[model samples]
Target: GELDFEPEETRSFMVNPDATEETVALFYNLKLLSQNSFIVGQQDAFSSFYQDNAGDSDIKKMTGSDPGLLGSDFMFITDDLNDGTPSNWFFQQENQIRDDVLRAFDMGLVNVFCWHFREPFEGEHFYTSEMTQFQRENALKSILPGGENHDYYKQKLEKIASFTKSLVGSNGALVPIIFRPFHEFDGDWFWWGQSFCTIEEYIQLWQFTVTYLKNTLSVNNMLFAFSPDNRFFSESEYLARYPGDDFVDIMGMDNYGDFNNQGQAGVERANQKLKIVSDLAEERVKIASLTETGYFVTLSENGAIPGFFTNNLFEALTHNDVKIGFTMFWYNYQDTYCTPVPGLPSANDFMEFVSKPEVILADDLPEMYRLPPN
Candidate 1:
């Protein structure tokens, strides 16, 4: 009967083989979400909702709408668990983070996690460029099951695995989460970037990571998402290092504005990338999304452009033949805010953006995790 949730002619989900009931429901619901209206989402939609303005609560208070989905990061969750100290990245403790996530689910907000994982090298951040050779050599060898770094790598994953497993509902059921790790690997900044390793090594690392989490740790409530930065001219370039269909459930891309081009080039590239991903999703029976996108005031000297969302972004997403399930804007961290801020110039335009009918905000979502009519 579980096979009934499988999309006709779609590839088997990597999570489906060991999926719990809620996870299966989530998989089916995501497929349905992709086919119908697109969901509007924001990273840190709640934790930073009132960062700029006191008394402001929820996205509606700031943008005149609530995002259908809310995103959080597990970048420091492992660190917190390992050190027993709160990084307070979002001005909240571990319990607060858990509570906020549960609240979002209760409000029918889709929750997704993007991990800005730390570099495994001691005393080094993920962006550190020092000791390139040492880090790369050890990191690659550590994942091969018998290397010295292997046990250390497994410990880090164990922390993440245990944390994700704790995201349970009131009935002690695993809360379905979109767990996106190793993001932007195509970029050269992180240690896992293409600059640091070969494609074969990257593929092996991904397979090892997923196999360990699912088969070993038994974390079945997560839907693995593979997102690369937008830099490719074709699907092959986009998926050059992709693990495989069995390891990916969501095909996504993170594209941001080009200050030099007034975001025009960025939008064009996103449309192109979306088409490629859309085709792949159909062929593989997976979901497609604009996983991470942002329009920053600091980047654009002209500030948030008028009608950028309604005129530019909305048109770009809807005009394509691809049915993107959701579009998630980056968080509002002061001047870096993607949406609106009180007494800010961009607030008015952001309100107009989310007000569009094509956008499905938090208050507009249906029973997203529920089964649809046959």
Candidate 2:
């Protein structure tokens, strides 16, 4: 069973649960650039997860002809996602990715979800694994006379901002992209969250990412989304990490659909999370996504998917008042892991969920497919 929550579990997850896969695809397609008009309409060779230039075919192979429809889970898994070196891995070929992503741009996507960055062999990228032996050894040397200052992160942000800026074009104007950096703070696993640094330091990192990229690099086409890891912690705990409104454009949360391992429905949990984020960021746009959801909930023992996309997931969108613009179901991950683990359904079921009329709000649906809740 999932860990027990108090009667009024401190959280509820709310989201626009019934988004189409096409919308999902669009979300990530447009983020190739930012909000700065100076950078828009100017195209340069670009890089990142959207494409690959090297002879390597992993990204294309995994994404299928149209990835958003196939519904694969993509991950910026740090140095561990799929290893080699930066120069050798998919990240190295920027131009190739730019071309491919540009194609997605032409087709129209819902929103582009770009997040997570990893350095060579430093800090734990995500997930709380504790300081490695290597970290213990380097701690003493980190404070040396020429020790790197916070300005160092500014340089890193500038590089990414410059690179992302190069991918913009005038034709890409209508495209909306959601750029979330260092998301998921409730968890101790990631270097950006609760475990690694104080709330002040963490918020600084966030503001720094926005300011450096905006000032130094000409890229500014993105609508920023502040997504936090689900910890069910109080609003104070969550808000403390926010860099400030200047750096945040939207409020969002990344929750998993594991269902507590009991096969119980989780629409309420999803509702809870959304309610908190919206309440905190009032007047600002709010979004919620199963940023990294699992499809394996009842493969071996279950009879029905209680909170499956068709049910609990579907209700959140139609019934809730929180304005949720888009939800990019985690897709494009490895087939094996993406497959039903033991208790849940397969990714194919999720793809099917995308087709159901219930999952698509009435406004987006045709007269025939539209159905009112019973």
| Per-model TM-score on C-alpha atoms | 0.88, 0.62
Per-residue lDDT of 1-374 in model 2, one digit per residue for the tens? 01122212211211212222222323222211111000101011112211223232222232222223111111332223334246655444444444545554554332344544442245333233555644433322232224353444444455555445555534644333456666776765554556556676666666656655555564545456687766664677567677775566556676664343424346666666655665564433233333444333222444435436555554543345443434444432223222222233343454454455333321231221111222
- Could you tell me how far off, in angstroms, the CA of residue 17 lies in candidate 2 after the best superposition? 29
> Residue-wise lDDT of candidate 1 within 249-342, one digit each (tens)?
8888887743224566666666777789878987777788889876666534546666677666776676676677788988776545667665
> Candidate 2 lDDT (Cα, whole model)?
0.42
lDDT minimum window of 10 residues, candidate 1: 1-10
lDDT, residue 157, model 2: 54
